[PDB]
Each structure stands twice: as structure tokens, then as C-alpha cells.
Amino acid sequence: ETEEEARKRNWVERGWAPWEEILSPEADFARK
Amino acid sequence: ATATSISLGIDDLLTIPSKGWLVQDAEQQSLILEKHHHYGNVHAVEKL
């Protein structure tokens, strides 16, 4: 479904959680 | 072509002098990039 229940599915069932990543400045530049 | 004569030995295959540095430097950038590729700095296509 849309990204309000499909996102809900990942949390309640598959244990998803947006844990923060500590990116190095060399890896920070790659994503941005 | 006889009186002068020509032949092929092992030291007549004269590699250019600067190959010692260029290949060494080429290996360094391949070592660094393949080391950062495991850090997530670059993706697979960039390494390829």
C-alpha cells in the first residue's frame, strides 16, 4: 500500500527502525 | 643486412625507465580505492 501502512508493516513485523548512522566526512560527502 | 647483422637478446627489450614509478603509483590508487570501497565511500560502479 502507500508509504504510511507499508512503512508501518516494516516496523511492527520486520523490526525496522531508522537507527542513525555515524558517517565519516568522506562517506558523508558521498551520500549528499 | 648481413655485414651489419642484427639479433634479439634479452637486454635489447628496453622497458622505458619511468615504468617503475607509473605502475607503483597505479597500484597505490587501486589499493586506496579498494580500501575505501569497503568503507562505503564509493559504490561498485565507481570501482569498476
Side-chain angles (χ1 to χ4, degrees):
Chain A
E1 208 212 322
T2 37
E3 304 283 299
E4 293 94 23
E5 154 78 28
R7 172 164 77 245
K8 171 191 306 296
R9 188 93 82 66
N10 276 324
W11 175 286
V12 303
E13 274 179 356
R14 297 194 248 285
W16 171 80
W19 304 106
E20 51 275 348
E21 301 161 334
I22 312 305
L23 321 166
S24 51
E26 281 98 22
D28 192 18
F29 172 62
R31 306 193 51 166
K32 285 193 279 204
Chain B
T2 309
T4 297
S5 188
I6 43 166
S7 293
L8 212 63
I10 301 296
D11 280 41
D12 326 299
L13 307 170
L14 197 86
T15 305
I16 87 162
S18 69
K19 185 186 174 182
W21 301 312
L22 299 194
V23 183
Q24 216 175 352
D25 267 285
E27 277 180 336
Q28 273 186 47
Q29 288 149 32
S30 292
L31 255 59
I32 282 168
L33 177 99
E34 95 154 289
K35 144 162 171 53
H36 275 239
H37 174 238
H38 292 56
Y39 293 177
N41 303 137
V42 315
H43 58 77
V45 182
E46 260 150 25
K47 198 181 91 59
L48 156 71

